[PDB]
Amino acid sequence: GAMAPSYRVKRMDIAKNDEECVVNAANPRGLPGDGVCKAVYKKWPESFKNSATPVGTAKTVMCGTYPVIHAVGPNFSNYTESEGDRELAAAYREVAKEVTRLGVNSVAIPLLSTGVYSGGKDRLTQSLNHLFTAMDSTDADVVIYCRDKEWEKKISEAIQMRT
Ligand SMILES: NC(=O)c1cnn(CCO)c1
Numbered sequence: 491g492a493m494a495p496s497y498r499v500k501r502m503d504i505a506k507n508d509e510e511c512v513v514n515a516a517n518p519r520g521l522p523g524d525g526v527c528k529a530v531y532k533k534w535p536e537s538f539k540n541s542a543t544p545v546g547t548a549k550t551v552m553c554g555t556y557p558v559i560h561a562v563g564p565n566f567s568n569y570t571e572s573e574g575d576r577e578l579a580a581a582y583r584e585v586a587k588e589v590t591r592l593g594v595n596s597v598a599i600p601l602l603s604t605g606v607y608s609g610g611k612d613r614l615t616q617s618l619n620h621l622f623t624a625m626d627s628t629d630a631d632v633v634i635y636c637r638d639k640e641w642e643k644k645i646s647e648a649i650q651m652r653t
C-alpha cells in the first residue's frame with residue numbers, strides 16, 4: 491500500500507507513466523485498437539497474449555514483470571444508457587480487484603468509455619465517479635491520465651473537492 495494513498499491527474503501519454511502497473515482501455519477482442527489501446531500495444535505488445543475478455547471485466551497480462559490490466563468499458567453506441575452505466579461501473583470494480591491482488595503501491599488509469607466508446611457524449615464526470623467508487627477502498631496511489639487541457643482542469647478540481 492502507499493503510505494498516504496492519493497489521487498493525482500497528469501496530461502500525457504499513459505505509455506510514459508511512472509506507476510507500478512497500467513490499466514489499458516481495451517477492446518473485448520484483445521486487438522491493438524486505437525487511442526490509449528494502440529499506445530499500450532506499442533509499449534507492451536507482449537501483454538496482448540490472451541488478453542480478450544468480456545465487457546465489464548478486467549484481465550491482467552504481464553509484460554515481463556510489469557502488469558497490464560486490460561479493462562473493457564462499454565461502447566455507448568451499442569449499450570443503452572442504463573446497461574452501459576452498469577457495465578462501466580463493473581469494469582472499474584474489476585480493476586480495483588486486480589490492483590489489490592497484484593499488491594502494487596501505484597496504478598496509472600485512463601477514464602474508460604470517454605473516447606470512441608462515449609457514443610458522442612461527454613462522460614468525464616460519469617466515468618471519473620465510477621473510478622472513485624471502485625478505487626476509494628484501495629490503498630494504491632492512483633494517477634489518472636488524460637490528453638485534453640480542459641479535462642485536466644476538471645479532473646484536478648474533482649480530486650481537490652474531496653480533500
Ligand atoms: N496514449 C494515450 O494515452 C492516448 C492516446 N489517445 N488517447 C485518447 C484520446 O486522447 C489517449
Ligand SMILES: [Cl-]
Pocket residue numbers: 501502503506
Ligand atoms: Cl506525452
Ligand SMILES: [Cl-]
Pocket residue numbers: 636637638641
Ligand atoms: Cl482527455
